[PDB]
Amino acid sequence: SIQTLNLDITKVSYENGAPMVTVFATNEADMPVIGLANLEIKKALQLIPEGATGPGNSANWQGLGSSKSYVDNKNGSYTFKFDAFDSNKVFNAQLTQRFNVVSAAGKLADGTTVPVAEMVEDFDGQGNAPQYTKNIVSHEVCASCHVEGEKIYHQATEVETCISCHTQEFADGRGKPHVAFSHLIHNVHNANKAWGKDNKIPTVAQNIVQDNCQVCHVESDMLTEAKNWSRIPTMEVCSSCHVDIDFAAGKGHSQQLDNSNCIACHNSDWTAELHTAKTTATKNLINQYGIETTSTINTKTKAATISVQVVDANGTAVDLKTILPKVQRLEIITNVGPNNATLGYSGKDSIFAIKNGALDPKATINDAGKLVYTTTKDLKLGQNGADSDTAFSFVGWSMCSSEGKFVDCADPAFDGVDVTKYTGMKADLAFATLSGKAPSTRHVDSVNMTACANCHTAEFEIHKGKQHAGFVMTEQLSHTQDANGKAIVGLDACVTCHTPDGTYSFANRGALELKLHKKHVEDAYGLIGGNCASCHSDFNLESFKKKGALNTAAAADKTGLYSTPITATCTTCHTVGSQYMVHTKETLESFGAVVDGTKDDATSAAQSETCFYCHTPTVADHTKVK
Ligand code: HEC
Ligand code: HEC
Ligand code: HEC
Ligand code: HEC
Ligand code: HEC
Ligand code: HEC
Ligand code: HEC
Ligand code: HEC
Ligand code: HEC
Ligand code: HEC
Ligand SMILES: [Ca+2]
Ligand SMILES: [Ca+2]
Ligand SMILES: [Ca+2]
Ligand SMILES: [Ca+2]
Ligand SMILES: [Ca+2]
């Protein structure tokens, strides 16, 4: 029943010596929550100030104990006492006092379900507001990539709880400097050294975080120590990624025996700039130029002509001739039937209209300075229902770049493997109809690029390398808004290649309905698990009525096997015959499904599935049945 448990420390009194701490618990409606059985002060701490343990040294949380002893006051308030407060006799009323309060997920007596809740609050030594803090990050940055409300590795769900246990005192006591949170946190996302008894190399963490300080260190008016990432250089933290320096021995660096002089040479401006220089320069390059793309069908030849207008940062026309020698690639992929693409991967129209400053002979720049390209593949417009009246064209492009500048592509044969030599630019999408009626467009209301950008950043150059320019997904290809009038950046353009017939092979589950699920259930399950909300605002179950067969397997002879579309969509994570699927192939067929059959059988059965008679999936609970 309870969706969110709010916790406030409303009162701290030292009038009896050891503090009495009152917590007030409210639900999402701000109603008092009575009967909490698993409330605890997980840690009582006080803040040793910046520099007190030595010149250049970090502020530290000194341990004062913990408590599970509390009275339920029957009004939403709970009052803690400490049986053994400050066992080390270090309590100092001149220091900031911190309390880390946790409520374990569980159930009240009446059976009301209660979610986990965690918080910290800081005070002075009399229970008033604090005079100074160590507020550098907030839990929210972790939720960008780790499912909110789930434990991150172990122990807790919020970074402040991690910080309250993984203290300098904790690390010193175990003779393990590396388990201090300010070392650990960088260590577990950086592949320069392994961590844990089993020496995990953080290959995946490294691939996502890419040492980008700004995914966790965010400037914030609520966090007065947010600039500590550049302002407090110490061998203890800087060594977490810089693993080959021995400061003591002067190996990899001049000898340093303490943190006294780090800041004298490692000025905040330099530390901040050097660690963010390349992502900032790339983002600046991406935002220099745009494209505006149109498509028309010649009603007699039934070929689409795509026109690309380059524009500058202010939406002002740039003649493509003026920048052609710096255009590394421009690719146009055209498919048909945006709700159920009809040409497959092999049948799609595709061209590198530009490669390393050279126009393909099939592409021209007109006197208006636009690129013009006409499809050559049969688009089969109108040959598969009303949806097949619409051709949709995905434009991806890249410009040659070195050290934050656009450069001439000096090498015609440059293969696009070295991604330091070019920038993927903003991709576009253009619709055209044979009939001259308004085009169909695919739904974009269930998943969008904002979800992707949480883990991959808004500057994600998708497929950048030898095969592709790299697609940057922006409002350039938005054709609808959400309830609040924000432009939706959909992945509808991706269907040009991620077709119901799959991609280059019938074996890859290349259909967009399957591919993102396949990739992320295999490689991102530690981050996502069953958390559909990581990509989905909702499920568009109505879209299934516009789908046909979906490619789900390759037969022995390399030909395509297909499933009815709901079965195909669910089976990506619930493989038939595996421990992840209770329904046998026979049972799925009894519910109207075709499972890895012919395209004709799957197509004929595509609207015969009874799955949604029983299954009532929501993003909150996709497992829900009658
Ligand atoms: C929109 C819903 C998303 C798109 C489009 C993509 N993702 Fe992800 N993703 C994540 C991890 C941890 C990996 C594996 C990294 C690794 O193995 O090193 C991936 C992988 C991809 C890939 C493959 C190419 C690449 O690694 O860059 C593509 C093309 C891709 N993803 C596109 C993490 C996340 C994540 C965090 C919880 C979210 C919300 C998404 N990905 C969503 C999308
Ligand atoms: C996306 C840009 C991330 C942000 C922001 C944070 N983390 Fe992360 N983390 C991320 C990835 C891709 C990985 C590798 C996961 C894997 O499956 O290998 C991790 C790893 C961790 C770990 C290690 C335990 C493990 O999952 O292997 C911990 C303890 C961890 N992350 C914690 C963490 C905290 C506390 C964050 C907020 C400060 C945080 N992460 C941000 C991706 C991202
Ligand atoms: C105490 C109440 C803890 C809280 C809260 C968190 N962690 Fe922890 N962690 C704790 C101990 C006692 C240990 C073992 C230390 C040792 O002697 O080896 C750990 C270990 C980790 C590790 C492994 C680190 C390494 O081996 O280098 C990770 C990655 C880790 N802890 C992460 C972590 C995160 C993200 C937390 C907040 C959600 C967190 N821990 C809280 C004790 C405590
Ligand atoms: C999330 C995965 C992070 C990324 C990426 C980086 N940092 Fe970080 N940093 C993070 C946390 C959760 C903490 C602990 C905050 C606390 O309250 O204890 C830190 C701490 C630092 C510090 C220490 C500051 C101090 O007062 O001693 C420094 C100097 C620091 N981080 C630097 C840093 C740099 C240079 C990064 C990019 C290369 C960077 N961090 C990434 C979480 C994350
Ligand atoms: C991992 C998250 C890191 C932490 C924590 C710190 N640094 Fe770093 N540093 C990191 C990378 C990936 C790079 C290369 C950046 C690039 O694009 O070139 C760096 C680079 C430096 C440099 C540049 C010169 C050199 O020889 O590397 C300096 C002077 C440097 N880093 C200093 C530094 C200090 C003082 C840190 C603690 C505050 C620090 N780094 C943390 C990755 C990470
Ligand atoms: C001036 C006399 C310095 C003092 C004192 C410290 N460092 Fe340093 N450091 C300095 C220079 C000129 C360089 C090379 C810069 C470059 O761009 O090449 C460095 C390098 C580092 C690095 C990065 C090493 C690498 O990437 O290979 C780190 C992490 C670093 N320094 C940290 C650091 C700390 C923590 C210090 C106090 C203990 C410290 N340095 C002192 C110049 C000076
Ligand atoms: C044709 C020019 C393509 C366009 C446009 C897009 N993708 Fe793609 N993708 C393509 C191929 C040939 C492959 C390999 C075969 C396969 O089916 O896996 C892929 C692969 C992916 C993957 C899997 C992981 C990877 O190999 O990178 C994902 C998650 C993926 N593609 C996503 C994707 C998105 C979101 C697109 C629109 C921005 C997109 N692709 C366009 C071919 C083509
Ligand atoms: C990001 C990595 C994703 C996660 C995590 C989940 N889904 Fe997804 N889903 C994703 C994409 C890119 C698409 C394709 C949209 C398109 O235009 O075809 C989908 C599609 C679905 C569908 C089809 C209906 C629709 O809304 O388009 C269903 C029924 C669906 N997804 C279910 C689903 C469930 C149950 C998940 C949690 C276990 C889940 N998805 C996670 C991307 C991602
Ligand atoms: C991967 C992105 C998934 C897609 C697509 C779908 N499901 Fe799923 N489901 C997934 C996971 C990781 C889990 C948890 C498994 C575990 O035990 O941890 C589930 C679970 C279900 C369940 C409950 C388990 C059971 O035995 O019944 C149901 C009923 C379920 N899933 C249904 C379902 C349907 C109908 C889907 C298509 C609309 C579907 N799932 C897609 C991961 C993914
Ligand atoms: C009612 C008679 C059902 C019809 C029709 C279909 N399914 Fe089902 N499904 C049903 C139940 C009662 C369960 C188990 C629920 C639980 O939580 O244990 C399921 C389970 C699934 C799952 C999860 C499988 C697993 O994790 O082992 C999936 C992916 C699933 N069902 C898909 C599905 C499809 C695609 C259907 C149409 C062909 C379909 N189900 C019909 C009940 C019923
Ligand atoms: Ca308070
Ligand atoms: Ca909280
Ligand atoms: Ca590491
Ligand atoms: Ca456009
Ligand atoms: Ca029907």
- Measure 120 CA to ligand 10 centroid, in angstroms: 42
Query: Residue 446 in contact with residue 539, Cβ under 8 Å?
Result: yes
Ligand 2 atom nearest 207 alpha carbon: 12
- Per-residue DSSP letter, 243: T
- Measure 479 CA to ligand 14 centroid, in angstroms: 8
Q: From CA 146, how far away is CA 388, in angstroms rounded?
A: 40
Query: Residue 376 in contact with residue 395, Cβ under 8 Å?
Result: no
Query: Residue 405 in contact with residue 323, Cβ under 8 Å?
Result: no
**Whole-Å CA distances, 157 to 102, 150, 222, 348, 515:** 10, 5, 20, 46, 29
Q: Which amino acid is at 236?
A: E
- Measure 513 CA to ligand 8 centroid, in angstroms: 6
Query: Residue 74 in contact with residue 129, Cβ under 8 Å?
Result: no
Tell me the β-bridge partners of 290. Answer: 311
Q: From CA 507, how far away is CA 511, in angstroms rounded?
A: 11
- Measure 579 CA to ligand 1 centroid, in angstroms: 25
**Atom 31 in ligand 6: residue holding the nearest Cα:** 253
For the chain, the distance separating the N- and C-terminal CA atoms, rounded to the nearest angstrom, is 19
Choose the residue to mutate in 135, 146, 201 for probing ligand 2, maximizing ligand atoms within 8 Å of C-beta. Answer: 146
CB within 8 A of 375, min separation 6: which ones?
303, 304, 305, 306, 334, 349, 391
Residue where the block lists tokens 């050559």? 376
Query: Residue 395 in contact with residue 428, Cβ under 8 Å?
Result: yes
Residue of 212, 192, 213 lying closest to 202 (CA atoms): 192
Q: From CA 98, how far away is CA 164, in angstroms rounded?
A: 9
Ligand 7 atom nearest 503 alpha carbon: 17
Q: Output the six-digit token pair for 432.
A: 């055209």
Q: From CA 344, how far away is CA 498, in angstroms rounded?
A: 8
Residue where the block lists tokens 């697609």? 471
Name the CA radius of gyration of the chain, rounded.
Answer: 29
CB within 8 A of 66, min separation 6: which ones?
40, 41, 42, 43, 44
Q: Is 31 in the pocket of ligand 10 (CB under 6 A)?
A: no
CA 3 to chain centroid: 24
Q: Output the six-digit token pair for 598.
A: 């012919």
- 409 labelled binding-site residue: no
Residue of 76, 119, 97, 87 lying closest to 12 (CA atoms): 97
Neighbours of 402 (CB within 10 A): 10
- Measure 561 CA to ligand 15 centroid, in angstroms: 22
Q: Output the six-digit token pair for 461.
A: 């150059």
Query: Residue 33 in contact with residue 76, Cβ under 8 Å?
Result: yes
Q: From CA 291, how far away is CA 399, in angstroms rounded?
A: 13
Residue of 366, 363, 354, 345 lying closest to 414 (CA atoms): 354
Q: Output the six-digit token pair for 213.
A: 């300080």
Query: Residue 353 in contact with residue 365, Cβ under 8 Å?
Result: no
- 189 labelled binding-site residue: yes
Residue of 515, 563, 565 lying closest to 540 (CA atoms): 565
Query: Which ligand lies nearest the alpha carbon of 622?
Result: 8
CB within 8 A of 336, min separation 6: which ones?
342, 343, 379, 380, 381, 384, 388, 390, 391, 392
Neighbours of 321 (CB within 10 A): 12
Residue where the block lists tokens 């940057």? 472
* Torsion angle, alpha carbons of 29, 33, 37, 41, to 10: 80
CA 139 to chain centroid: 15
Q: Output the six-digit token pair for 590.
A: 């009894």
Q: Output the six-digit token pair for 28.
A: 């999402």
Residue where the block lists tokens 């309590």? 91
Continuous segment of H or E residues that includes residue 525: none
Query: Residue 452 in contact with residue 444, Cβ under 8 Å?
Result: no
- 468 labelled binding-site residue: no
Q: Could you tell me where the DSSP H helices lie in 287-400?
A: 320-323, 344-347
Neighbours of 210 (CB within 10 A): 13
Q: Is 156 in the pocket of ligand 3 (CB under 6 A)?
A: yes
Residues in the chain: 626
**Atom 24 in ligand 2: residue holding the nearest Cα:** 153
Query: Residue 47 in contact with residue 134, Cβ under 8 Å?
Result: yes
Query: Residue 252 in contact with residue 246, Cβ under 8 Å?
Result: yes
Q: Is 509 in the pocket of ligand 2 (CB under 6 A)?
A: no
Greatest pairwise CA separation for the chain in angstroms: 91
Helix (H, G, I), strand (E, B) or coil at 536: strand
Q: From CA 526, how far away is CA 191, in angstroms rounded?
A: 17
Residue where the block lists tokens 């392994």? 194
Buried b (16+ CB within 10 A) or exposed e, 76-113: bbbbbebeebbeeeebeeebbbbbbbbbeeeeeeeeee
Q: Is 208 in the pocket of ligand 2 (CB under 6 A)?
A: yes
Ligand 1 atom nearest 473 alpha carbon: 5
- Measure 612 CA to ligand 15 centroid, in angstroms: 10
What is the 3-state composition of the chain as percent helix, strand, coil, each rounded to the nearest 5? 25, 25, 50
Q: Output the six-digit token pair for 97.
A: 């006092």
CA 105 to chain centroid: 26
Q: From CA 98, how far away is CA 125, in angstroms rounded?
A: 10
**Whole-Å CA distances, 103 to 10, 65, 72, 327:** 16, 17, 13, 56
- 583 labelled binding-site residue: yes
Q: Which residues line ligand 4 (CB under 6 A)?
A: 58, 134, 136-137, 159, 163, 181-182, 185-186, 189, 209, 211-213, 215-217, 228-229, 232, 234, 237, 275
Question: Strands across the sheet with 20-26, in order?
Answer: 6-13, 20-26, 77-80, 70-72
How many Cα atoms occupy the beta-carbon half-sphere of 242 within 13 Å? Answer: 14
**Atom 15 in ligand 1: residue holding the nearest Cα:** 204
Q: Is 264 in the pocket of ligand 6 (CB under 6 A)?
A: yes
Q: From CA 622, how far away is CA 598, in angstroms rounded?
A: 28
Query: Which ligand lies nearest the alpha carbon of 9?
Result: 11
Buried b (16+ CB within 10 A) or exposed e, 30-62: eeebbebeebbbbbbbbbbbbeeeeebbbbbbb
**Atom 30 in ligand 9: residue holding the nearest Cα:** 623
Helix (H, G, I), strand (E, B) or coil at 125: coil
Query: Which ligand lies nearest the alpha carbon of 58?
Result: 4
Q: From CA 234, how far away is CA 231, in angstroms rounded?
A: 10
Query: Residue 557 in contact with residue 565, Cβ under 8 Å?
Result: no
- Measure 472 CA to ligand 7 centroid, in angstroms: 13
Q: Output the six-digit token pair for 401.
A: 């770049």
**Atom 29 in ligand 10: residue holding the nearest Cα:** 570
- DSSP character string of 407-456: -----TT--S--GGGEEE-B-EEEEEESSSS-------SSB-HHHHHHHH
Q: Which amino acid is at 225?
A: E
Q: From CA 454, how far away is CA 466, in angstroms rounded?
A: 26
**Documented resolution in Å:** 1.9
Residue where the block lists tokens 């604090």? 130
- Measure 152 CA to ligand 13 centroid, in angstroms: 17
CA 291 to chain centroid: 26
